[PDB]
Amino acid sequence: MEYTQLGRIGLKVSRLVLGTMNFGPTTDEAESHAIMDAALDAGINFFDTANVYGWGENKGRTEEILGSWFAQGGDRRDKVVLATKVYGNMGLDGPAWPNHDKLSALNIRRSVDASLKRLGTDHIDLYQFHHVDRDTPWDEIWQAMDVLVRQGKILYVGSSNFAGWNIAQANETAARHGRLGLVSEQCLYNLCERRAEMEVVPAAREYGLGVIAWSPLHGGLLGGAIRKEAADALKDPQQREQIQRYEDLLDKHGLEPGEVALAWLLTRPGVTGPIVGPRTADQLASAVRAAELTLTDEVLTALDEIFPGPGPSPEAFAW
Amino acid sequence: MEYTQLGRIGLKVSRLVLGTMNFGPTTDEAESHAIMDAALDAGINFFDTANVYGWGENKGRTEEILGSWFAQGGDRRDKVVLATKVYGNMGLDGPAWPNHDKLSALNIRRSVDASLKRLGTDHIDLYQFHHVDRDTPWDEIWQAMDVLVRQGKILYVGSSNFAGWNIAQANETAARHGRLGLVSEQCLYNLCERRAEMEVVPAAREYGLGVIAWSPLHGGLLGGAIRKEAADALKDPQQREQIQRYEDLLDKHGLEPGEVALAWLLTRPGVTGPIVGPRTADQLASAVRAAELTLTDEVLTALDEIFPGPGPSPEAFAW
Amino acid sequence: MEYTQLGRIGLKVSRLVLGTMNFGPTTDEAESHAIMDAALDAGINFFDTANVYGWGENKGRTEEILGSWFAQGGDRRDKVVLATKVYGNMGLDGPAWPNHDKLSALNIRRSVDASLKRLGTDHIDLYQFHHVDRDTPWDEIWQAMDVLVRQGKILYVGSSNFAGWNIAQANETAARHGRLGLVSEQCLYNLCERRAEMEVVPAAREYGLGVIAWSPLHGGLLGGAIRKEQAADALKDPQQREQIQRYEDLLDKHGLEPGEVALAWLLTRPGVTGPIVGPRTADQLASAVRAAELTLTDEVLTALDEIFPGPGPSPEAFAW
Amino acid sequence: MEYTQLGRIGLKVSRLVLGTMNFGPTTDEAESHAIMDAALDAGINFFDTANVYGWGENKGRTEEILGSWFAQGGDRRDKVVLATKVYGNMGLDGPAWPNHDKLSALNIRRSVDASLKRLGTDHIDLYQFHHVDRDTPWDEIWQAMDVLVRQGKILYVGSSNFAGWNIAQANETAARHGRLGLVSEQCLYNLCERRAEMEVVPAAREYGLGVIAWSPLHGGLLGGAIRKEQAADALKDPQQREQIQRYEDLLDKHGLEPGEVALAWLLTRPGVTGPIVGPRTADQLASAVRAAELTLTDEVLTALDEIFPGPGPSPEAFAW
Amino acid sequence: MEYTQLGRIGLKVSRLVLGTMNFGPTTDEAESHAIMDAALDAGINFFDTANVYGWGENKGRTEEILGSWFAQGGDRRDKVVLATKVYGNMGLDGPAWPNHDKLSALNIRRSVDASLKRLGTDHIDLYQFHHVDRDTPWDEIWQAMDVLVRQGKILYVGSSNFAGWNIAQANETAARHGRLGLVSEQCLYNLCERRAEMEVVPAAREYGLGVIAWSPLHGGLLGGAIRKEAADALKDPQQREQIQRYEDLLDKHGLEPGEVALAWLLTRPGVTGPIVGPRTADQLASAVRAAELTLTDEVLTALDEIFPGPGPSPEAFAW
Amino acid sequence: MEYTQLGRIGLKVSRLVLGTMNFGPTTDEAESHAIMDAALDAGINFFDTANVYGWGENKGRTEEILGSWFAQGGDRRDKVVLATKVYGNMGLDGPAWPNHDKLSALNIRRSVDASLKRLGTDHIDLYQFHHVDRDTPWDEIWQAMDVLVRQGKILYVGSSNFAGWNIAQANETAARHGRLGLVSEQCLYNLCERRAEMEVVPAAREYGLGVIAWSPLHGGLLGGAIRKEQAADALKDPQQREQIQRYEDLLDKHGLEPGEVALAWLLTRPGVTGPIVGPRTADQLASAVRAAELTLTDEVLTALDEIFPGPGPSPEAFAW
């Protein structure tokens, strides 16, 4: 297993991040536990979840399944970097009750307390905003997070679905009073969708955040979706031809589209690694092979032809 | 129900603030509980109280009635923005024992502890000074409030009955060391009394505080006090004629004086909204209609004729 | 002559401030010079001017008259705490060309250069904002003013016609980065108009600004206006004349001059450095000097306060 | 003429910005001067230039033309908010000698001295970075710029062609030590190219920068380019011509000029101070003045938005 | 009873400070309790003690006697401003074990914990250094005190037996990071010993500290020590004549030397008031009369003749 | 010649400080110049003056004598650490005109310009406050002094006749915004007057100021005053003469000069940079040079301390 520092900080993480979103809705408690044990034995120490994972009136379940996993002992809690999230509505879907979503100090206080209980642990390692909230100022947010830090209930703060300027404003606000700022950003980044390269990844790299790519197969579409007979891209013939060129290229070189989508992300400057969400032990073994896979300059070249990136702003749209 | 951000912060509040001052002296526990339930169902999430509410040797009772309301469950505590106050003497009326009123770190420590117990909650959402105390410096006050913030016992700090310069000094002191300053000011503001417009509301707006108007009917006087046969204004014929012109104008347009007093405040720049203190469910329904009521430019114009405002300083008295 | 510190700072000033706005429109150069020499002789060291003084097409004239006064030598410049002002349109009366009034760093730069030229001096001691500009941020303003301090062109910064909250915001912003903030506020304050008490004077006292009262006789109304019917609009209102009448009558009984009393009153108010004495002749100065030696009895102060009630500090003024 | 504050600061500017890049390559000195006088007459006070303007072996010429304009007197320098730029190679076209482009403190020093000489003025009002330099730190850049502020050589600092995150990093660094940060960003923004909306315009609004739109007609494409086939590459692409065709057709129906509409549109966007009007003759100015008096209906704005969809703010633009 | 702000802070204190040093060694528990009750009824709210009070192997006893007083209820703890001290050796007299005296963060942590237990309260209102410790830096000291402040265990910090420069250095260090600095200094100050006037009281006044005078009768010597037939001053005939002139002056005007020693201190600029240590209820009544006593300019004048002060530095020794 | 750092700073100075107050009142220009050349020759690099030196109608004369000394060239200005002072009234003896003494930014500006003119130099190395001014705030004072540092007119700032708490307040205020604080305190300190030990010398040592002792022979009393009866008021008091007698007698026994011993004693005190040697002739300098080569035995130090007991540090001096 390949390890790297999470951005500028002292924390060492596996380049694969184990996503837990299938634990509950798709994978049952017992199967989830076995996959997490297999993850540890493959050397994956970095586990990502969220309070909303489980969905519907079952939001929280994924966190509970990790909770019951830790309760078995054998150093499970101790050896994992536990990441969860705050922002999402945890009541019934539809318009949230005021301050029961987003990033007010009020919502942060209630969300973390429920998360800690469901996870059956006294501390979260990495507590991440699930989305930017432009209506809450950073002196309010950092107040909330620092309370938790001084109580020993979180160690690190991270982001998800931010613009680059939000990363800068966040970390500058934090540094002003000596606080450790965001240590990571979780952004949608894959061959089909590369606009994170304009400003999100440049900012993250400037401010020493780890970059974690979610939806690394663009919702399946990069996992061989044509060979097996997301959906909206297959109807548009422009994008369909793009994936067809993709699959044809990978047949020729004898590589799995699932695996290269992940290995490609592992080559991008600033990327810590992708989130992999296996529903089974065999989907996990396949992610581990993708982490080992070396892609040639020739393949790297042709992927860029099919899947061109926009470049950094302002060059992407000006000069 | 109309919602707005409380000044610059991430907290979302109903434009009506439910005042609780009648709960105890006028309205019994059981009736108070029903009014708070009706408030929630109308979408009011912002509840205001104070340690002194109850009065006499019954100070604290209002807080206790909210305490017993929360103890019923059904997500009552969770969905309310709970505001209370510190400053007032909680012993027998007359000269307070030293440091048993005002804003010393000593009085803040003892007042919050008693408030938390009476409210049967481990945290207050918005803890407000009831009045400025010019004898306590802001490094002392912010020490006290920050202790509470870091213990998780309060989230936000607000003010009541401050001058504009006190808001500036407060928030500047707070920002110097990274602390979130005042988020709201509760001031006496209504058609009859508009001197808050000179400096209090300008300062509040400059520093991103929500503005909350108390005594919105000027102690009844704007609620149709002539038609029904505060008192001191009715004897002075100058002010009497003012209200007479008011009531006559509102007959003509077919509007309730109770309702327009509130809707007028909802039009003023910087005003979050009025505090409404119903003693019954029907007084609450009437406040909700006032929140919906649109006042015409024509009516707005004539109210300003009858009830002229002083404008901002220094223009109000110089140029 | 009574001296005091200007607020919290090390500068000592006469409790009488020499205002110069009549120099040019009313009093010519040579007569203006005589008054300024008489002010020195009486020990008044604090001279207040403005770029706009002169009026109409002659804005700048007052500054020029001080400049020609200094050009005579004789320790004049050296003895005087020279104050002037920025904010006002120095062009044709009417709407200013953009950035040719108000408190942008652009207008500050151009306004101070023209003031230094007319005053024929290399430095202003107290450079004051004539009015608040709510569209200009304090980091902008303190940038402009700190450039001037570092070049030696000004020493101290003051205000005029601010709200209390503007004073706090100014001085907090300055202090965050080591800078000396506002040292003085020049506010409208006299027996008739007392609303500076609500928040302006409280804020100034808290931040240690001197408080300088302009229009100390309320435009002549407190200077024996009724007796000298042998301000215009005030005497037409019945209720306001009533108020002045009682004033004039009370001073008759006690054998006191209305002109001196209005200034002596201000000298009793907490945090008040002193009034602006704006002379047109040698008489205003001597009158003010007599005002400053006057001791008003508690009975007279009491009666004055019944006639001329004040609002008190806010929030109590309008609430509790 | 419509005025606004430049972002959060005290400086008032016309919503039309006079761009000068045609002065020299297209329009000669005397004709350039006529346009600048016509701009004053229309109340435009905000003039934008650059050191590189002039082109090729004549880089510097535009600055010189403004300098000769100011040398005529008549309140010209005093009325104008003068903006110019640094970053660009002022030598032979081709790879610059090291530190003779970009934003090192070394190039800033030399570039500003040459600009002040060509402009025949002792100060620039708004000194702007022409492009982001990712190899120069903000403590270096703010050192260089603060030297200039303290000497009186510039008042305000602006950017051009920055990312949103560069704006935040700049202004946070400034504010940490009291300094006034960027006051304006000059970004490429028009109906055809709307990606400034993703992060640049959001960041500018948050930090209170003015937003100045350059290439407001997308290099002439939005100025009636099809009808005037009696930008080059755009008309060759079928899909893009389709887009312009619908534009021209829609404006036919409503009786509106393409040239005026492209600017009026920008005047509706949140946080946009105004477009760069770059005249070659007196016509561009008058056209822009008409653009600024235009009220576009919600129906026209709606239709424009169907033809010319924007990305919206990031992260929603590419995710949720 | 006369009340005043304690220096610049919001805390209001009686001008008499009740010293407790006799409670234990001289006055028994029960008599001490009655004196503290009489103090409350006279309006004295400000009570001073120390961990070492009790002396010998009985150090701590005085704190315990206050502890048992509070345990009776009737709002005793609530209405008192409780002051104690840290610095002194609490083991056997002689050379202290290292870090068992002075002001290391180690000694502060152990001293406060023992003090809180003996006092049977969860917080001290005013925690005072008993002496300057020039070997401990202010970043260490303020660390220690801020820990306690954020835990809610102390409110305010004060000093005792400091030089003026130590007050300045202390408060400047505190303000640098937003912390409330020293609020009071307890110094030896009385008619016989006025060198506190050189720099200690000037500094205290500049930095808004209350000034509290200990040994206000110079160890008895100003309490009519000649009439009744400290001791070392009576043998020196120079000082003896000084007190003789004192007693003769006070016979003439018909005043008690005990009472004027205290009233004189209440006239000095910057002085909050004296510490009074009654051993009986009647010594307390006498202190209360001294607080009421007005001294004439004539008497003030002659006291200054007999007991000249050195003036401020540098004028006291240069110009 | 013995050298040391001035307190915590990088400046090296002779342990003997050349005081110049006799230059003018006692010693004329030409003789003054000879002493200053002899000081250089002995390796004394630290020269102390004041604006007020000269006395009465001749205040400024000492500064002028140094100026004419420097005008001779020969590396004189370059070799010397030049110190002078501000605070004192430079006008007619009597109550100063307001702001013409003390430490307002106004008096600092005027006082330094006049000092630079009389000294015929463009910079002062160590500019010292002659006395504490309790009515002037440290943000005011550090403003004035930082203007001068940035223009190159002074390098270092020192004090004279401060309390310990004034030193701490000064240096804490400076350090809050990066500024170098006081580097030296000049206090009255000799065998007879030892109260600087209570708090002034402790504070200076804590903040790393040099300590310069003025009046090191207590106005001549420690210079063999009794033997040279062949300070005036001291010899009249029986108890004080007793003290000096024992001093003179003890030095007889040990074969030591009173004049040299009083200075050598100061050279032993912790934190003392050195005494002010103020010469009227070449003799004071040579005497001081001999003082600095003297080693006083522990027996002599012990006896000196019995005769001349000190207070020790406060709080122990008056309490415990």
Residue numbers in the entry:
A (entry chain A), B (entry chain A), E (entry chain A): 1 to 229, 242 to 331
C (entry chain C), D (entry chain C), F (entry chain C): 1 to 230, 242 to 331
Paper excerpt:
Aldo-keto reductases (AKRs) are a superfamily of oxidoreductases capable of reducing carbonyl to primary and secondary alcohols, found in all phyla. In this work, we identify the enzyme AKRtyl, which is responsible for tylosin reduction. Phylogenetic analysis indicates that AKRtyl is the founding member of subfamily D within family 12 in the AKR superfamily. Specifically, by combining steady-state and transient kinetics, X-ray crystallography and molecular dynamics simulation, we demonstrate that AKRtyl exhibits a positive synergy mediated by an unusual Monod-Wyman-Changeux (MWC) paradigm of allosteric regulation at low concentrations of the cofactor NADPH, but an inhibitory effect at high concentrations is observed.
To obtain the apo structure of AKRtyl, we remove the carried cofactors by denaturation and refolding. The second apo structure has only two active conformational (R) subunits in an asymmetric unit, by combining with other asymmetric units, we can obtain an octamer containing two active tetramers (R4R4). We therefore propose that the basic unit of MWC-type allosteric ensemble is a tetramer rather than an octamer for: (1) The tetramer exhibits ligand-independent T and R conformations, suggesting that the equilibrium between the T and R conformations occurs within the tetramer.
